Amino acid sequence: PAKIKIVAPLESALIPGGETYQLRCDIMSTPAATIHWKFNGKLIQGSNELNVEEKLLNFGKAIVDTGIVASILTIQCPSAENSGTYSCVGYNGHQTIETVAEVEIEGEGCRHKSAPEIVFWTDSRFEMTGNVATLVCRANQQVDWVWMSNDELVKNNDKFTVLSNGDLVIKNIVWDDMGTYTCIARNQFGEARQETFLYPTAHH
Amino acid sequence: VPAPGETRACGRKLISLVMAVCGDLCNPQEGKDIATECCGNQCSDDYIRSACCPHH
Numbered sequence: 001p002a003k004i005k006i007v008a009p010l011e012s013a014l015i016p017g018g019e020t021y022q023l024r025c026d027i028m029s030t031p032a033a034t035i036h037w038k039f040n041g042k043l044i045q046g047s048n049e050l051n052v053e054e055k056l057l058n059f060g061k062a063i064v065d066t067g068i069v070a071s072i073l074t075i076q077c078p079s080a081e082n083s084g085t086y087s088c089v090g091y092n093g094h095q096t097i098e099t100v101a102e103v104e105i106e107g108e109g110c111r112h113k114s115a116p117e118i119v120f121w122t123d124s125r126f127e128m129t130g131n132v133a134t135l136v137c138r139a140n141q142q143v144d145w146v147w148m149s150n151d152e153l154v155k156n157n158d159k160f161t162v163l164s165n166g167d168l169v170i171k172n173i174v175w176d177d178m179g180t181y182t183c184i185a186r187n188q189f190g191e192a193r194q195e196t197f198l199y200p201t202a203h204h
Numbered sequence: 205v206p207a208p209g210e211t212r213a214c215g216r217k218l219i220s221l222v223m224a225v226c227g228d229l230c231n232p233q234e235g236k237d238i239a240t241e242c243c244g245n246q247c248s249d250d251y252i253r254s255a256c257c258p259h260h
Contacts, residue, residue, distance in 0.1 A: 007224045028224040064249045068220060124217040126249060150209070175246045179210035197217040201249040 002094035004029040007068055010088055010101035015078055018110040023073045025088035025099050026123060030066035032136070035120055037073045038087040045073055046120060046138075048091045054169070057132040064201055067124040069136070074117060077110035078103075115190030116143045118166075118183065122196040129203040133173050135196040137166040137183035148182040173200040205244065214243035218252065226257035 008026035015021050027033050032054075036046030069090070075082050083105045089098045120138040127133035137145070147154040147168045154160050154168065161169040168181055178199055185192045206214070219239040223230055238255045241247065247255075254260070 005224060007220070028221065066221075066249065066253075068217075068224065124221060126221070126252070128249065129246075150207075175206075178206055178214060178246075180213040195213075197213055199214065199217070199252075200246070201252065202246045204248060 002030060002092055003066075004033055004090055004092050004095045004097045006090075006097055006099045008070075009099040010086060012102040014104050014106050017079050017105045017107040018077055021075045021078050021103075023075075023086060023088070023101070023103075024070065026068055026070045027088075027090035027097065028066070028068045029090060029092045029095075031063065031092055031094075032065050032067065032122075032125065032134075033069050033090045033092040035069060035071040036089050036091075037071070038085075038089065039082075040084040041087075045140075046071065050091075050093050051134055051136070051167070054132055054134045057169075057171070061131050062128065063131060064126055064128045065133075066126045067122060067199075069120065070123045071120045072117070073119070074140075078105045079108075080105055113189050116141055116185045116187050116192045118185050118192045118194040121183065121194045124197045124199065126199045126201055127173060129174055129200045130172060132169065132171050133198055133200070135168045135170070135181050135183070135198060137168075137185065137194055137196065139166060139185040139192065141187065143185040143187055146184045146186070148184065149179065154181065168196075170198065173198065175200050211243045215239045218242050221252065222256045225253050229259075230256035 005028045087100045116139045122136045219235045222235045
């Protein structure tokens with residue numbers, strides 16, 4: 001049965017102007033959820049789009065698809081225009097949830113040519129042995145992606161596909177695939193990294 | 205048996221999932237036992253979700 005729950009909520013805050021600020025939320029969901037953010041009710045990051053491709057790849061299978069997704073919203077140079085209500089919204093195709101906070105800027109040399117950031121990722125994905133699973137990372141711009149596992153490059157082959165959007169798609173998962181997969185987003189100025197985690201559950 | 209580094213990463217992610225499902229029904233010391241069990245041995249989805257709070 002589908003389920004969704006806040007794991008790490010937003011909290012309201014009076015923050016200094018002109019100092020970089022970051023919000024984080026984490027949501028548990030089955031099937032996999034996406035997160036988008038709103039400011040005073042208006043969409044500012046992310047979308048409601050879901051992993052339709054993996055659902056096709058798991059045609060005919062009993063699917064576990066559960067885990068925690070995380071997202072971060074960065075305000076580079078907070079000013080009075082950034083004061084208001086921030087919402088982190090989760091959606092899994094069946095249910096929604098949200099966590100909300102009021103952020104107020106207090107106070108008035110704040111800065112381009114910077115590394116990307118990874119703003120949404122699979123903190124954990126559980127899926128049954130024998131199915132396809134996806135580890136998701138999304139950046140704040142178009143990027144070049146590389147994935148690592150066990151300190152080695154993940155190469156594209158019959159089992160692993162690295163997509164241009166930041167997904168790593170792993171077919172026919174087995175217990176030996178359990179562990180951490182690091183997504184690395186690069187542009188011409190530098191890189192951002194994030195860890196994701198896969199758990200292939202037992203198939204009885 | 206998983207490599208030790210995969211067991212390491214697993215323990216944190218598994219206890220987080222168990223605590224999120226079970227809430228206050230799962231003491232962190234009991235979630236840790238399920239995390240250790242299921243990060244050295246492969247567990248089912250049902251066991252991971254229910255072992256720390258069998259009455260849901």
